Design an enzyme around this catalytic site. Structure first.
Site, PDB file in Angstrom:
ATOM      1  N   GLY A 115       4.959   3.298  -1.336  1.00  0.00           N
ATOM      2  CA  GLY A 115       6.184   3.607  -0.634  1.00  0.00           C
ATOM      3  C   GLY A 115       6.212   4.969   0.015  1.00  0.00           C
ATOM      4  O   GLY A 115       7.183   5.295   0.714  1.00  0.00           O
ATOM      5  N   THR A 116       5.174   5.775  -0.182  1.00  0.00           N
ATOM      6  CA  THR A 116       5.148   7.115   0.393  1.00  0.00           C
ATOM      7  C   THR A 116       5.171   7.065   1.912  1.00  0.00           C
ATOM      8  O   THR A 116       5.672   7.997   2.555  1.00  0.00           O
ATOM      9  CB  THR A 116       3.906   7.852  -0.098  1.00  0.00           C
ATOM     10  N   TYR A 117       4.639   5.989   2.492  1.00  0.00           N
ATOM     11  CA  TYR A 117       4.526   5.825   3.935  1.00  0.00           C
ATOM     12  C   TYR A 117       5.425   4.712   4.462  1.00  0.00           C
ATOM     13  O   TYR A 117       5.190   4.202   5.564  1.00  0.00           O
ATOM     14  CB  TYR A 117       3.078   5.530   4.320  1.00  0.00           C
ATOM     15  N   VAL A 164       4.284  -0.759   3.714  1.00  0.00           N
ATOM     16  CA  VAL A 164       2.952  -0.973   4.261  1.00  0.00           C
ATOM     17  C   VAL A 164       2.267  -2.064   3.453  1.00  0.00           C
ATOM     18  O   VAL A 164       2.327  -2.067   2.219  1.00  0.00           O
ATOM     19  CB  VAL A 164       2.119   0.323   4.253  1.00  0.00           C
ATOM     20  N   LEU A 212       0.827  -1.196   0.000  1.00  0.00           N
ATOM     21  CA  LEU A 212       0.000   0.000   0.000  1.00  0.00           C
ATOM     22  C   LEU A 212       0.865   1.250   0.000  1.00  0.00           C
ATOM     23  O   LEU A 212       1.993   1.240   0.497  1.00  0.00           O
ATOM     24  CB  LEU A 212      -0.924   0.035   1.227  1.00  0.00           C
ATOM     25  N   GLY A 213       0.319   2.325  -0.559  1.00  0.00           N
ATOM     26  CA  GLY A 213       0.908   3.637  -0.422  1.00  0.00           C
ATOM     27  C   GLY A 213       2.009   3.959  -1.407  1.00  0.00           C
ATOM     28  O   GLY A 213       2.539   5.076  -1.363  1.00  0.00           O
ATOM     29  N   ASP A 240       1.179  17.439  11.568  1.00  0.00           N
ATOM     30  CA  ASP A 240       1.386  17.112  10.159  1.00  0.00           C
ATOM     31  C   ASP A 240       0.054  16.908   9.451  1.00  0.00           C
ATOM     32  O   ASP A 240      -0.105  15.991   8.639  1.00  0.00           O
ATOM     33  CB  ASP A 240       2.277  15.882  10.005  1.00  0.00           C
TER      34      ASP A 240
HETATM   35  C1  LIG Z   1      -2.880   0.026  -3.864  1.00  0.00           C
HETATM   36  N1  LIG Z   1      -3.690   0.515  -2.732  1.00  0.00           N
HETATM   37  C2  LIG Z   1      -4.904  -0.005  -2.546  1.00  0.00           C
HETATM   38  C3  LIG Z   1      -5.701   0.429  -1.495  1.00  0.00           C
HETATM   39  C4  LIG Z   1      -5.220   1.415  -0.636  1.00  0.00           C
HETATM   40  C5  LIG Z   1      -3.948   1.954  -0.855  1.00  0.00           C
HETATM   41  C6  LIG Z   1      -3.470   2.930   0.051  1.00  0.00           C
HETATM   42  C7  LIG Z   1      -2.890   4.115  -0.381  1.00  0.00           C
HETATM   43  C8  LIG Z   1      -2.424   5.042   0.561  1.00  0.00           C
HETATM   44  C9  LIG Z   1      -2.553   4.789   1.935  1.00  0.00           C
HETATM   45  C10 LIG Z   1      -3.127   3.585   2.388  1.00  0.00           C
HETATM   46  C11 LIG Z   1      -3.285   3.301   3.786  1.00  0.00           C
HETATM   47  C12 LIG Z   1      -4.514   2.789   4.241  1.00  0.00           C
HETATM   48  N2  LIG Z   1      -4.704   2.507   5.539  1.00  0.00           N
HETATM   49  C13 LIG Z   1      -3.732   2.702   6.472  1.00  0.00           C
HETATM   50  C14 LIG Z   1      -2.484   3.238   6.129  1.00  0.00           C
HETATM   51  C15 LIG Z   1      -2.241   3.485   4.730  1.00  0.00           C
HETATM   52 CL1  LIG Z   1      -0.643   4.102   4.186  1.00  0.00          CL
HETATM   53  C16 LIG Z   1      -1.596   3.260   7.411  1.00  0.00           C
HETATM   54  C17 LIG Z   1      -0.353   2.534   8.064  1.00  0.00           C
HETATM   55  C18 LIG Z   1       0.698   3.646   8.540  1.00  0.00           C
HETATM   56  C19 LIG Z   1       0.138   4.808   8.271  1.00  0.00           C
HETATM   57  C20 LIG Z   1       1.170   5.658   7.486  1.00  0.00           C
HETATM   58  C21 LIG Z   1      -0.104   5.403   9.690  1.00  0.00           C
HETATM   59  N3  LIG Z   1       1.065   5.875  10.407  1.00  0.00           N
HETATM   60  O1  LIG Z   1      -1.174   5.454  10.204  1.00  0.00           O
HETATM   61  C22 LIG Z   1      -1.226   4.561   7.282  1.00  0.00           C
HETATM   62  C23 LIG Z   1      -2.287   2.197   8.250  1.00  0.00           C
HETATM   63  N4  LIG Z   1      -3.706   2.459   7.946  1.00  0.00           N
HETATM   64  C24 LIG Z   1      -3.593   2.681   1.433  1.00  0.00           C
HETATM   65  C25 LIG Z   1      -3.182   1.465  -1.933  1.00  0.00           C
HETATM   66  O2  LIG Z   1      -2.081   1.883  -2.156  1.00  0.00           O
END
Ligand SMILES: Cn1cccc(-c2cccc(-c3cnc4c(c3Cl)[C@]3(CC[C@](C)(C(N)=O)C3)CN4)c2)c1=O
Length: 291
Positions: A24-26, A29, A21-22, A135
Site C-alpha cells: 500500500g505504500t504506492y 498495485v 504489491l508494495g 523524488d
Molecule cells: C509482495 N511483493 C512481491 C514482489 C514485489 C513487491 C513489490 C514491493 C514494492 C514495489 C513493487 C513494485 C514493483 N514494480 C513496479 C512497481 C512497484 Cl510498487 C510500480 C507501479 C507504480 C509505481 C509506484 C510507479 N509509479 O512506477 C511502481 C510499477 N512497477 C513490488 C511486493 O510487494
C-alpha cells in the site's frame, strides 16, 4: 480528459491479477500476468470519477508515455474502465531498495556504486528531456529479479508540473511583475540538479539505512537547510567507506546548485566509473535477502 491515448477497456480482458504489491505504500498495485504473452506486469489502479481533478494524473501519464530508457521503469499504457484508471508498468520483482535494505542491512560500497551509476544513467536521460524526477530515494529505485535498477514513481514530478501549469493559468497580467517572480512562476525556482543532491542523500540512505537527520522534525530540517551556514551531510562511519565514496558524497551534496555536477558529469566520477559494476552485485544482495 486525463490523456488522449488511454485505452477505454477493462484491463482484466488482457491481464490476470495475481498479488498486491508494495504493502500500500504506492497505492493499489497488483502483480499481473498478460493473458496472451504470459509476461508479468505491475498494474497501479487509481480512482478517476467524472468530477475529480485529473490534472496531476494527466501530467504523470504524459511523463510516463514519453520516457523509454532501460533505467526508467517501463510504461505499457493505461486503461480507463468504470471510473478506475489502471497504469500498466514493468514489474520489478524484488521491490524497492528500501524493501530490500530493511531486511539485508546496509548495502556494500560496490552495490551502492552500481545503483548510483544506473540511477545517474536514468537521470541523464530524464534531464536530456528537460524532465526532473524530484523524488529520488531508496523507495523509488526498484530492482527486478535480474538485479537491474529502475527509477520509478513520477507522482511528485507530476504534482509539481500540474502546480506550475495552474499557477501559470492564474498568474494574471505580467507587466508590473519582477523577472524573478515570473521565472519562479514559469520554471519553479530550481532545476534538475536537485536530483543529483537527492541521489547523494540516497547513497547515504543505502549506506546507513536512514537519510541524514531522519530523527529531526521535518520543519526543523527545512529551516536548517535555509540557514546561511548549513553544512552538507556526510557519511558517518569514516573508515567503512573509501575516499572515492566520501568524495562522491561531497560533490553530489554541493549546496550551491550552480556548482553541483550534472548527471553526465557524475557518470565520470571514480565511484561509478570503476570496473566490476554489474547486476551480479545486486543478485548477491538478493541472495542475502533470501537467506
Ligand atoms: C509482495 N511483493 C512481491 C514482489 C514485489 C513487491 C513489490 C514491493 C514494492 C514495489 C513493487 C513494485 C514493483 N514494480 C513496479 C512497481 C512497484 Cl510498487 C510500480 C507501479 C507504480 C509505481 C509506484 C510507479 N509509479 O512506477 C511502481 C510499477 N512497477 C513490488 C511486493 O510487494
Amino acid at each position: 480528459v486525463v490523456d488522449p491515448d488511454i485505452f477505454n477497456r477493462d484491463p482484466r480482458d488482457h491481464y490476470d491479477l495475481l498479488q498486491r504489491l508494495g504493502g500500500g505504500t504506492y497505492g493499489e498495485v497488483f502483480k499481473a500476468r498478460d493473458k496472451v504473452s504470459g509476461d508479468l506486469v505491475a498494474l497501479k489502479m487509481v480512482k478517476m470519477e467524472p468530477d475529480d481533478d485529473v490534472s496531476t494524473l494527466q501530467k504523470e501519464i504524459l511523463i510516463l508515455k514519453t520516457c523509454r530508457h532501460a533505467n526508467i521503469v517501463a510504461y505499457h499504457g493505461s486503461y480507463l474502465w468504470l471510473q478506475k484508471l489502471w497504469i500498466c508498468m514493468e514489474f520489478c520483482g524484488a521491490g524497492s531498495l528500501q524493501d530490500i535494505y530493511q531486511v539485508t542491512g546496509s548495502l556494500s560500497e560496490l552495490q551502492i556504486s552500481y545503483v548510483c551509476r544506473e540511477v545517474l544513467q536514468g537521470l541523464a536521460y530524464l534531464h536530456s528531456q528537460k524532465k526532473i524526477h524530484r523524488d529520488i530515494k531508496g523507495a523509488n529505485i526498484l530492482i527486478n529479479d535480474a538485479g537491474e535498477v529502475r527509477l520509478a514513481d513520477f507522482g511528485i514530478s507530476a504534482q509539481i508540473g500540474a502546480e506550475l501549469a495552474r499557477r501559470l493559468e492564474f498568474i494574471g497580467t505580467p507587466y508590473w511583475m519582477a523577472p524573478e517572480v515570473a521565472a519562479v512562476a514559469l520554471k519553479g525556482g530550481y532545476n534538475e540538479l536537485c536530483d543529483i543532491w537527492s541521489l547523494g542523500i540516497t547513497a547515504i540512505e543505502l549506506a546507513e539505512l536512514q537519510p541524514p537527520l531522519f530523527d529531526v522534525h521535518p520543519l526543523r530540517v527545512l529551516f536548517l537547510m535555509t540557514k546561511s551556514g548549513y553544512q552538507p551531510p556526510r557519511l558517518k562511519e569514516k573508515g567503512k567507506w573509501s575516499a572515492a565514496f566520501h568524495n562522491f558524497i561531497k560533490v553530489t551534496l554541493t549546496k550551491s546548485p550552480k556548482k553541483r555536477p550534472s548527471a553526465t558529469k557524475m557518470l565520470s566520477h571514480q565511484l561509478v566509473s570503476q570496473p566490476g559494476l554489474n547486476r551480479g552485485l545486486i543478485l548477491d544482495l538478493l541472495d542475502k535477502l533470501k537467506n
